[PDB]
Amino acid sequence: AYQLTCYFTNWAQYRPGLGRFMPDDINPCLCTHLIYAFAGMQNNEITTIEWNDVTLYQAFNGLKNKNSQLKTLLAIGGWNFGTAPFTAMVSTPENRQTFITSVIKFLRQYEFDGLDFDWEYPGSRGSPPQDKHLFTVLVQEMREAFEQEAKQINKPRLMVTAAVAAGISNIQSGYEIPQLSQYLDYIHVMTYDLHGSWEGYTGENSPLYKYPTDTGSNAYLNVDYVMNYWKDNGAPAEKLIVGFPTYGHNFILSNPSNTGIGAPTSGAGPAGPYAKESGIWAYYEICTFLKNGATQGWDAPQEVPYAYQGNVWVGYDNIKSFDIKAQWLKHNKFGGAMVWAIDLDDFTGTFCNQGKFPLISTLKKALGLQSASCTAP
Ligand SMILES: Cn1cnc2c1c(=O)n(CCCn1c(=O)c3c(ncn3C)n(C)c1=O)c(=O)n2C
Ligand SMILES: Cn1cnc2c1c(=O)n(CCCn1c(=O)c3c(ncn3C)n(C)c1=O)c(=O)n2C
């Protein structure tokens, strides 16, 4: 009935000490689908990007030995990858053919159940206007090559899914929604990074509803607006997967006296000691900040927490907000939840004193998957 899709990132292995996260750290009963971020591309063919990716693939796909129902996908692209290889690859039927062949081969060789396209984004960040429609052609041709490959080797079809924009402008210049929706198995909407320090004021990473003071285009930066846009503009509810972030965005306050939503800010907040990401803290890093006696807030209109101390403020998601969004997604009949990322939840259980994978476990319980079988073949 609901999917729970979880991204695993292949650079989490480089975090120090308790933050290091490898495929073996994934509980195979937790998610219904796991997505490996990221593969890359070289002369129009899918390829690995870390020296040890093949060893990781093996361990990641090997979790399917513990839970025969689990599916895995490989994600290509992401933020840093940009758009240039995608633009060149989609630009001719030959480049597309080259790529699609490389993928069926890669995916079968290392035992993935599908590909998740994370092009960020067709039509933006240097990608020319023709890419909007070329992305559709790619996806159609891929879905079709998958259909024919399943008939000519008699196994179930590889899946094709896509992680897609939450920005209205990015959506508009990027996607033929009705057509994409025909050929994609799932649509993973990146409903997070909806606010952050680049804006110059405090704001939530992934608020469910708008702030009562949000007007004009600021009224579009919430999960409700974004998922309703996708749905009303042609995507079937059941293929639409709501993104949930297991991290939050932090800011430097311009005035440690003004600590509400919309308070002015002077820049990104500090990198955490584990993910080392400027302007971002993993949920387990934020739990450290809370133990440190940060003042806890609740943004009641948008249903998400925030916290602050001295001149550092952070808006994030906790068990409460994840539960609330998960009830909402069920009421609205979406297909399920996607989580970025499994390595940013409190996976050891030792930072938050809420059990192992508190955030993602909340979703497993709320989406009624507590009883999902976890048995080998
Ligand atoms: C598709 N997608 C869906 N949600 C996402 C992304 C995404 O790409 N990124 C941005 C991910 C940036 N990044 C990389 O891409 C990346 C990396 N190291 C190697 N790569 C290749 N790092 C340290 C990094 O930070 C996110 O932060 N989120 C929430
Ligand atoms: C306008 N801007 C400036 N910094 C930004 C943004 C922004 O819009 N977003 C919302 C999501 C898109 N995005 C960026 O734009 C972005 C970025 N790294 C550098 N930039 C520029 N990343 C990882 C990113 O995901 C960000 O996350 N960051 C950090």
Numbering used by the authors: 21 to 397
List sentences quoted exactly from the publication behind this structure.
Mammals have two genes encoding active chitinases, chitotriosidase (CHIT1) and acidic mammalian chitinase (AMCase), that represent an ancient gene duplication event and show sequence homology to bacterial chitinases (Bussink et al., 2007). Chitin accumulation is limited through hydrolysis of β(1→4) glycosidic bonds by chitinases, members of the evolutionary conserved glycoside hydrolase family 18 (GH18). The loops on the AMCase TIM barrel [(βα)8 fold] produce a deep active site cleft similar to other “bacterial-type” family 18 chitinases. Acidic mammalian chitinase (AMCase) is produced in the lung during allergic inflammation and asthma, and inhibition of enzymatic activity has been considered as a therapeutic strategy.
We investigated whether bisdionin C would inhibit human AMCase (hAMCase) and/or human chitotriosidase (hCHIT1). Assessment of chitinase activity using a fluorescent substrate revealed that while bisdionin C inhibits hAMCase and hCHIT1 in the micromolar range, it does so with no apparent selectivity. To facilitate structure-guided optimization of the bisdionin scaffold into a potent, selective hAMCase inhibitor, the crystal structure of the hAMCase-bisdionin C complex was determined to 2.2 Å resolution. The native structure of hAMCase has recently been reported (Olland et al., 2009), giving an rmsd of 0.80 Å with the structure reported here. Bisdionin C spans the −1, −2, and −3 GlcNAc binding subsites of the AMCase chitooligosaccharide substrate. The methyl xanthine units bind at the bottom of the active site, stacking on the indole groups of Trp31 and Trp360. The hydroxyl group of Tyr212 forms a hydrogen bond with N9, whereas the backbone N of Trp99 forms a hydrogen bond with O6. Water-mediated hydrogen bonds are formed between the carboxyl group of Asp213 and O2 and between the backbone oxygen and nitrogen atoms of Gly97 and Phe101, respectively, and bisdionin C O6′. Interestingly, the N7 methyl group of bisdionin C appears to impose an unfavorable conformation of Asp138, a key catalytic residue that hydrogen bonds the catalytic acid (Glu140)/substrate N-acetyl group and stabilizes the oxazolinium ion reaction intermediate during catalysis (Brameld et al., 1998; Terwisscha van Scheltinga et al., 1995; van Aalten et al., 2001). Given the unfavorable interactions of the N7 methyl group and the nonconserved amino acid substitutions on the opposite side of the xanthine moiety, we explored the effects of the N7 methyl group on potency and selectivity.
